Write a protein that binds this ligand. Structure first.
Ligand code: ZN
Ligand code: ZN
Lengths: 554, 554
């Protein structure tokens, strides 16, 4: 529901921007102003969506969901705190102003005679207060319910400055316009709307425009001949003295910063000095070390998904089997144990590291067997009676079943029961791709562990013939669990399947080995285009393996 | 990979904030200054994460994914465009300067004599050039490796200004510091870093300091007696001339705005024009209409999930069956057709609405049958050839199969083929909870449609016995499809199962009716705590139903 504030922000902004648009045009073409009261409309807009005017078998299955409500709970607390802070700041300022008010003093007759001389031409209701002070360096004013104008006593002493009449007209207009009343009203609203920072932008614009209107007023009551003087006189007020911004809830002649002002202050002040160079030196040293620290951990690129770059250690040949892949564009690798030679189709692609998906079960099964979580005599794993997508997964499984029916459940348990260090050790000895087992129990499926087709051939070959860091028993049960098909030319062992995301097949694989009447082959097929299904990867591998003589005994 | 960009932002801000902090302290406590060149450190820090370093069935597994890649692709193009725009703007300013470079003239001997007198005791390297032009209302400077300093031709003749001396030193400082060059360099970089506003923001710190240092150079070479004069000279320029900001790439005495200046401008602009009141009126009207359009679409609420306070239209009593539920805290309702009475356990909970989940099928089957999408002679639905958690669903089903095995697949097709208006009309006639069927065919499973235990009792009872908006065929085939258990005392009809979210069992249900040798009983059991499984809801119901006479005929 915090989103509802976002919605009112958007509306608020639509209104704001439209109004802002007009403001620009009005001035740009006709020197027109938009009465700032219009801004109250955005404030109203700020609450639109806010106000809720909306006027047998047991079944069981898992649905993924995110809880975003705990976030709003956190945001709620923050908003509360912000209000507390903002409310306080308002109050602090207010208290001060009240305290000051209590110290103010009325004027004498001659002073009144002057003030009256200045404003009698307006013939207004004197329901405002003109007082003086011994505190403030320049005049200020604040509504409170009394409209009090405070002029430092020195300005009455220096009655002779003449320009006081400008000062009076200026403040008169501010009082007339109830500027500090509108300000505090808006401030309350802004305090409440802690969720929309734009409110602090519009208040600034309002304040500026209000000041402009006062200038017009004042000028409109002054003989133009004196405008030169006027401009100088007004300007002098921010030249002669420093400014302070304590009175955030009220109006004054010199209460805010500018870069110009900072310079002038800095100039007046005795600020010509030098420092030991050690300051910069240590800052740059420590900044550097931080940068180093960050560097130690901040890095990376698309390179994570890249291919295998090495030449081969055994003899090699490049293949062209593109006619077989057809619409299922992909890649393929085969290796002859007898010849110590690789045959590679579409090498640039066959080299790409891909998540192994279902083919990892070949290795995972081996790991479970070697670690004796599953053995030959008893290769079974338990389950938790939750429902699974295939009948094979709603049964307890042995290894033979689990491999051929790709039982993720079985294998989730196989992963769960094998130490990460073991898995990492064997991924390293096997030269298994990026050797990354992640932290996810099913790290091989559309996740962290990646291997190319070329690597998959090299790696499975190592699993059977070069890697002697597993017991023979593991190799043997795995072999039996991998048989797919046997006939008079070959024994085809392995496992196919596909990585599928949001219902689309993207990573079809078939990995294994072939015992033929003439040689022993290792292979890996991967499909990415067309319909890169499990069965298609299997069929593509077989058509190629037939052409290469693997499945023909040739 | 936008995340690397995010890392860049983070790295930058860390150094930036650290540095900013240090700078604050230096000035805040001792008016110490740190050479702005340190800001290059943030730019450099921003490059850290961009270093590309690391220093036998067919199966597939369907993984849900968020596509953030299309977003980065789009964002990349945008980033490119933003760079182009910035480059363009830079160039246009540069070309303007290019023009000026071919326009101004060097100075004569006496003017040189004046300047040399000014810098006589400074003994600065003079590999700089001072030139004059009618195009300059106030002096400007630009690097180009030449230190091009221009003055108004208008002051050439001002033999008594006594300001040039300040002008020269001010200009000198900027030339000396190669401030313009540094800004050019920074501009290259900020053009590149289109994604992180701080890269441009920081320039304003640089610019301010550049001016500060120039003031120091000036003051450092001035008999303090005249410091006041210098300050007056600054303001004189501020007041005396308008500024223009074409030279966004260089420095000048009068090239920028300020609030003060705006006011001074306004004083000097006698824009004595009338503005019709229609201006604000129409703007306010249009704004209102904008608000109206948003309003008719913007409205939020927590109300959707509010349960009801509605009294019943038949007799009732409140139950306490807490020793049956035990650790499986939940709720329960039963209704007697002959007594016209409800029995409500833990009504504070039984009156809450939950998605019907596994039991919606009871009602959906009545609808599918009434519309004859499934009928008695042919109650079947087609299959999409996808695999599901239950063996029973990996096929085409009839109603009797589908009801007993909770076949959402079958029922999802039923949902698609029942006009939403018919479903909704009867959800309303039956008082089916929030009567919300969403927009999804599977709306009953941890989704939009919600109903209480009390309401399910009411709904089924009406749907089969009191509601005459459904056919006899529907009533009869439904009753058959719902049978789950029976013996010589009762026939128990109904269904059970549980909605599970992120692996946790949240909404367990058992809903049904019993036909006995005595009466007709309608009921619903729901579990939320403990292990709120379907079977538990069913077992709890059976224990209660026996006590309530439902399963015995009492
Ligand atoms: Zn004012
Ligand atoms: Zn400067």
């Amino acid at each position: 529901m915090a989103k509802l504030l976002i919605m009112s922000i958007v509306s608020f902004c639509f209104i704001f921007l439209l109004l802002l648009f007009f403001r620009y045009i009005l001035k740009r073409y006709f020197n027109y102003m938009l009465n700032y009261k219009v801004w109250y409309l955005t404030l109203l807009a700020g609450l639109i969506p806010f106000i809720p005017i909306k006027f047998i078998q047991e079944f069981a299955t898992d649905i993924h969901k995110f809880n975003w409500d705990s976030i709003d709970n956190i945001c709620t607390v923050i908003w509360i705190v912000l209000v507390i802070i903002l409310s306080f700041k308002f109050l602090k300022a207010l208290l001060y102003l009240k305290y000051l008010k209590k110290q103010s003093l009325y004027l004498n007759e001659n002073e009144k005679n002057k003030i009256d001389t200045i404003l009698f031409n307006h013939q207004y209701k004197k329901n405002i207060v003109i007082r003086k002070a011994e505190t403030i360096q320049s005049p200020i004013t604040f509504w409170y319910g009394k409209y009090i104008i405070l002029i430092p006593s020195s300005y009455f002493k220096s009655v002779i400055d003449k320009r006081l009449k400008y000062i009076i007209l200026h403040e008169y207009a501010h009082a007339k316009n109830r500027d500090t009343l509108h300000l505090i009203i808006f401030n309350i609203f802004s305090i409440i709307m802690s969720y929309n920072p734009l409110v602090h932008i519009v208040k600034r614009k309002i304040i500026h425009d209000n000041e402009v209107e006062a200038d017009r007023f004042v000028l409109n009551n002054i003989n133009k001949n004196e405008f030169k003087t006027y401009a100088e006189s007004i300007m002098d007020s921010v030249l002669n003295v420093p400014f302070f911004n304590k009175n955030i809830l009220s109006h004054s002649f010199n209460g805010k910063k500018s870069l110009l002002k900072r310079r002038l202050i800095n100039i007046k002040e005795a600020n010509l000095k030098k420092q030991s160079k050690l300051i910069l030196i240590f800052i740059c040293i420590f900044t550097f070390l931080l940068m180093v620290i960050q560097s130690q951990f901040l890095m990376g690129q698309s390179i994570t998904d890249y291919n295998y770059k090495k030449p081969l250690h055994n003899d090699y040949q490049i293949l062209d089997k593109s006619k077989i892949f057809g619409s299922n564009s992909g890649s393929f690798v085969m290796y002859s144990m007898k010849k110590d030679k690789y045959y590679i189709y579409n090498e640039k692609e066959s080299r790409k590291r891909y998540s192994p998906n279902s083919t990892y079960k070949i290795y995972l099964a081996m790991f479970g067997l070697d670690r004796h979580i599953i053995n030959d005599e008893n290769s079974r794993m338990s389950w938790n009676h939750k429902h699974y997508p295939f009948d094979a997964w709603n049964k307890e499984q042995d290894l033979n079943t689990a491999m051929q029916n790709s039982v993720n459940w079985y294998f989730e348990r196989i992963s769960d029961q094998i130490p990460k260090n073991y898995t990492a050790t064997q991924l390293k000895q096997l030269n298994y791709g990026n050797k990354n087992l992640g932290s996810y129990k099913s790290y091989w499926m559309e996740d962290s562990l990646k291997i190319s087709n070329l690597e998959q051939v090299i790696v499975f070959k190592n699993m059977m013939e070069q890697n002697n860091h597993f017991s023979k028993k593991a190799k043997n049960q795995l072999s039996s669990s991998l048989l797919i098909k046997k006939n008079e030319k070959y024994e085809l062992y392995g496992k196919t399947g596909t990585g599928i995301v949001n219902g689309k097949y993207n990573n079809g694989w078939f990995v294994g080995y072939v015992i033929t009447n003439h040689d022993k082959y290792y292979f890996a097929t991967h499909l990415s285009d067309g319909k890169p299904s499990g069965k298609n990867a299997e069929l593509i591998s077989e058509k190629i393996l037939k052409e290469m003589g693997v499945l023909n005994g040739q």
